[PDB]
Amino acid sequence: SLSTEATAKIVSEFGRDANDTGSTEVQVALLTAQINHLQGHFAEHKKDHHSRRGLLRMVSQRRKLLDYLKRKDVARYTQLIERLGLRR
Amino acid sequence: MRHYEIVFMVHPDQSEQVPGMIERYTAAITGAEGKIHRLEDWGRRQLAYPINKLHKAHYVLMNVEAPQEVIDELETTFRFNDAVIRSMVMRTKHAVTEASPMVKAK
Amino acid sequence: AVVKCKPTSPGRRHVVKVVNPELHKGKPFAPLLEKNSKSGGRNNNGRITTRHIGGGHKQAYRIVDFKRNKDGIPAVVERLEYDPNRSANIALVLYKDGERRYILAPKGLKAGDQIQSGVDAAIKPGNTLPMRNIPVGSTVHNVEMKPGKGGQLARSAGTYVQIVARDGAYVTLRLRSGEMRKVEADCRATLGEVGNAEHMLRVLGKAGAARWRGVRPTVRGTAMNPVDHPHGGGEGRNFGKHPVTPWGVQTKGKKTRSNKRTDKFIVRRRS
Amino acid sequence: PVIKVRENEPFDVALRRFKRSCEKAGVLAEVRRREFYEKPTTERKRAKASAVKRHA
Amino acid sequence: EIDYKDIATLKNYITESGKIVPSRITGTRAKYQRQLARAIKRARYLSLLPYTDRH
RNA sequence: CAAGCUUGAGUCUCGUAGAGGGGGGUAGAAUUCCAGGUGUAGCGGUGAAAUGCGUAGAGAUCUGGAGGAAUACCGGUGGCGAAGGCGGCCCCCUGGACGAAGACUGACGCUCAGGUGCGAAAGCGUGGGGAGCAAACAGGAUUAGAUACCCUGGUAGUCCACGCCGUAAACGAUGUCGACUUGGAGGUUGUGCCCUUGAGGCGUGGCUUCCGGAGCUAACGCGUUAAGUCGACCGCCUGGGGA
RNA sequence: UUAUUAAAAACACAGCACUGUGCAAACACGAAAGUGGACGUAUACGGUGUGACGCCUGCCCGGUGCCGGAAGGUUAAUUG
């Protein structure tokens, strides 16, 4: 998974505090970082279905978090999807 | 920087090339900002079974903390060195600076 | 990559071509080109000595360095180039002193890789060493059979040779034909295997595609008259005889190797 | 199952010791087990049945 | 704390023919039995222990 | 609709166990084959035989070599995985689960037609590889016959890379999620407490095997891992054949 | 493709298979030198049969051929 330092950096830049590790923005950012990191692994290991299942779990969890955020506050949703480079 | 435990056997006829091999390996490990936790020259030991029609191989043990590039170079060196008849690199959880039983027997 | 063309024409239906986006799209290196005139399979008597040769696209000969005797000096690969004279691709390398040469492109090589020949070269694909300095079991190509003569074995696309044993002044090689041969250790070889391995996957697709390569049609002996071929004529389709060459030598089984000079180097014949 | 006939022992006790050692090593059972192929389902069912009958 | 280099200790968990003894005979925990099996296999690789009584 | 809350659901910290997956390397035992030494008339196989190999020197034994496949002992109604499945050792990449004490978000949840993905073995396509085993096939037996069981061989296949196939008694013949309801003996994996007496005792989680109480069931049996008492959603059934 | 009575179902063909060939290659033209094969090197080259693709390609090694075997029998020049 992500190292401790990368996780701390993401939590700091996406959270309202250094301890706000549960915010929707922090969770979506961590999931996006893990997906982007896994992208390179699966480019080389196209036959790793067992890990791709966890990758798809991460993708679906990020999708549900983004849906909840868009339904809750669309402004933060837009800021997040522009800061992370989403929307296909 | 992960910790590794390196054990390699040398041909018995090449026992005096072992100090030079150790010198080169420590040079390569510390040159890459790595540490050496333990280094033990067990000397010649009777083999439990013949390896390449040989008995009485020369054993050396190393405990190093080094990146993966230098460890890959060390494995390549072991593979291409004809004097090293057998080697094995293993990861360890933490640094090991305690004397192994082979030298703890004395 | 291996791509199949869409059947927009009966001649294009079965064409399967090999595309390589890394090949140089441009003219080859001029100082390493020569005139390569066609022969039509005719010898100096003007007679056809090898049938089914003729026509095809004009080709210029690339001077490929098969000796690799520029030791000690590193070289970098500038680009991979198409070579019409062989099935493999060739790489234009640039030595440190400014000399450019053509070598057979091994598998995995790309522009920017660094190669070197000599007894001190590192063991990696592209390097050339005397076979006594190469570990037993390794896979090599462009092998010499006489020291300093130039590589002659494993030069086709995708081919390679593995050193199976070394003793005294000789090493034993397993050729791509499955034959075990002895070669003296001072002969040189290049690490790795020849690139363009998917060359065998291509399908020409139409009769004209073979004509571009200078291959004229092959007439079956049984389709001729008795004066032309031992397989003769007959009312209808008749064979009734053992298959032979146009000159009466039994094909399909009869061994033709007769060379007592080189028998001492053949450890075991192919099978 | 190496048996070295030590001094001051008759042959019969050495032979009986050799048999005891070769049976504690389980070589005959193994070479009788390995002479025919047992499907993975068959060996799993046999192990399950043996574990079930080892309950008394 | 089972070390493949501790052949004096590993020889207590192998038979006279070099085979690993089952955990039911020595009554050792499953976790330390797995550690012992791994250590014995590694020591067999390093030719510190025999694979069999033959070689 | 608006604002909340933390108990459902997630994030972070530190660790734990594991044949979870993908890639590369390597080790030993054994089978087969090749070459040679010793050695001589049998070997192999079966209920018994014969086909088969063997005086051109087999089988046995010893030495060297080649190649492929699978990993004895550990090993265990043991472990991991959604399922199919996963078993030498080492390294590289990587998913999930669990536990301790906290911090964080604040219903973000459950189920899911159509849809998509994974999916044993056999089978198919291309290129390799091929020791053992072995559909088809051949021969020897048995038999009234024997297109079989048994024997001697043996091709595809089994193995690798990449695609396809999408089926199994794919089974717990038991859909997923959540709550509640007496017990006993174990296994495995964390964690806490105590002159730690001990490989100790006492708690507290996760997964797991057997027995059994109420209850339920046509019965067999299930029984806190329910086939008991309920709730949400889905799939499916409507006599046997035809099918 | 039968110039000048036959244009076709014949020949070729891409594809397939077998087989030979380790490079001074096999093979071919050459009393020879040499040349072609090829400034190529088994993913290459020659020969033979078949003839895109799809589904496939069963049984027979007695005869003839080819390949392997080397014990034995027979057997040339030579030897005398």
Q: Where are the domains of chain A?
A: 1-88
User: What is the distance between the alpha carbons of residues C75 and C103, in angstroms, rounded to a whole number?
Assistant: 11
Q: Which residue is nearest to nucleotide G47 (CA to C1')?
A: C245
Strand partners, C172: C165, C182
Whether C79 and C145 share a structural domain: no
In this structure, are C156 and C176 located in the same domain?
yes
Query: Which CATH number characterizes residue C208's domain?
Result: 4.10.950.10
Inter-CA distances, C188 with B79, C72, C89, C192, Å: 21, 15, 20, 13
3-state secondary structure of E45: helix
CA distance C97 to D46: 74
CB contact under 8 A, D1 and E53: yes
Strands (E), chain C: 2-4, 16-18, 33-35, 60-62, 75-81, 90-95, 100-104, 114-115, 128-130, 139-141, 161-167, 170-174, 180-184, 188-191, 266-268
The span from the CA of B53 to the CA of C106, in Å, is 37
What residue segments make up the domains of chain E, in order of their start?
1-55
Tokens 């799209």: give the residue: C25
Q: How far apart are CA A70 and CA A64, in angstroms?
A: 10
Task: Quote the CA–CA distance of C122 and C191 in Å, as a whole number.
Answer: 10
Judge whether residue A30 contacts strand F, using its CB and a 7 Å cut-off: yes
Answer whether E touches D (≥3 Cβ pairs < 8 Å).
Answer: yes
Are C6 and C86 in the same domain?
A: yes
Say how far apart CA C202 and CA C200 lie, in whole Å: 6
Structural domain total, chain C: 3
Residue C260, both tokens? 């007592």
Tokens of C187: 């002969």
* 8 Å CB contact between A11 and A20: yes
d(CA C255, CA D28): 52
Q: Which residues pair with E20 in a beta bridge?
A: E14
- Stated in angstroms to one decimal place, the resolution of this structure is 2.7
Which of strand G's nucleotides are less than 7 A from any protein C-beta? Answer: 10-15, 18-30, 34-37, 39-53, 64-68
CA distance C121 to chain B (A): 13
**Interface of chain D toward chain E, CB-CB under 8 angstroms:** 1-2, 21, 25
| Structural domain span for residue C147 | 117-194
Residue E22 is which amino acid? P
Q: Which residue has the tokens 């091999």?
A: B21
How big is the CA angle at C234 (ends C229 and C236), to the nearest 5 degrees?
125
Peptide-bond breaks in chain C following residues (C–N over 2.5 A): none
Q: Which CATH number is A1-88 given?
A: 1.10.287.10
Same domain, C212 and C160: no
Rounded to 5 degrees, φ, ψ at C48 are -70, 110
Pick from C168, C194, C220: which residue ends a domain? C194
Q: How close E18 gets to chain B, by Cα (Å)?
A: 11
- How many degrees, rounded to 5, is the angle at CA D47 between CA D45 and CA D50? 110
